[PDB]
Every structure is written in structure tokens, then in C-alpha cells.
Design a protein around this ligand. Sequence first.
Ligand code: CL
Ligand code: CL
Length: 162
Amino acid sequence: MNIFEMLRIDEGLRLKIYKDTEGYYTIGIGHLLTKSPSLNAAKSELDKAIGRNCNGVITKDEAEKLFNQDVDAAVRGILRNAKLKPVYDSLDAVRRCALINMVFQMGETGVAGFTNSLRMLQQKRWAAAAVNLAKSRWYNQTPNRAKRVITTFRTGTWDAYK
Ligand SMILES: [Cl-]
Ligand SMILES: [Cl-]
């Protein structure tokens, strides 16, 4: 299992603009287009992102291209971030994937705000970190996806995804 398979399970693949769980305009494998109500702000952001007139529809190849960009942006974002980097560096490979997962979904800024959870992970206090992570809007809004990520942090294995 790897980061790509993991995120593909959590986000799905959609070739048509669609609205995410929060009502935001998204496409492909979890690629946020805009936080704006406007479907047109979305179709435009979309053509700008793809470099063609898409009219809200992209191909598989295009979805995977955006996905590669986003995973790469997530990983570099973490490595540049004074708060995230030390956590990432202290973790084993599987748990590193779990942190990338959260960063991909909530952005660098959102995750960096999980101060206490971050401390616990860095302290290798698995069980306590799992309990803390669950006390969040994140967990309450997308519980099944959050539980899979949380179990990943707790156990250090891919069990939740297999
Ligand atoms: Cl809560
Ligand atoms: Cl969910």
C-alpha cells in the first residue's frame, strides 16, 4: 500500500466538478477548486489548473496529473513547515503517510493547528494521540475517513486500509 493508493481510497475519483463534503467545488482525486459558491468561479479555476477549456470535465490522465501535483505539494509543504517537519522526521514510514494524508485533506495550516496531537505523536504516545485527534471537527465531519487515519497513527500498520 502506498500514499497514492491510500489517498485514492479516501478521496475517490471523480471526472466532473462536484461538491465535497463541505459543499466546495472539487474535481479528480480530492482536488479542491474553490471555496466560492460560484460554479463559475469553479469552472474557471478548473481551466486555469488544466490549461484547457474543460467545461467542468477532465480525463483520468488529467485527474492523476493534479493528484501527483497535490501529493508533492503536500509533502514539500510539510518539509518546509517548522511545526510539521519535526513530527514528520520523528515518525516511521506508515505514520508518515498518515500525516501526509491529513495535510492533503486539510492543508498545512489546519494540521499545524493540532498542537497537542502533534506533541503526542512526536512523543510516540500512540493511544493518547488517537484519543486527542478524535476530539475535532474533522473527526465529527468525516468519521470513517478520520478513523482510518487515526488507526493508522495508533497502530503504525495499513490495517485500516486493507
Ligand atoms: Cl470534540
Ligand atoms: Cl468519512
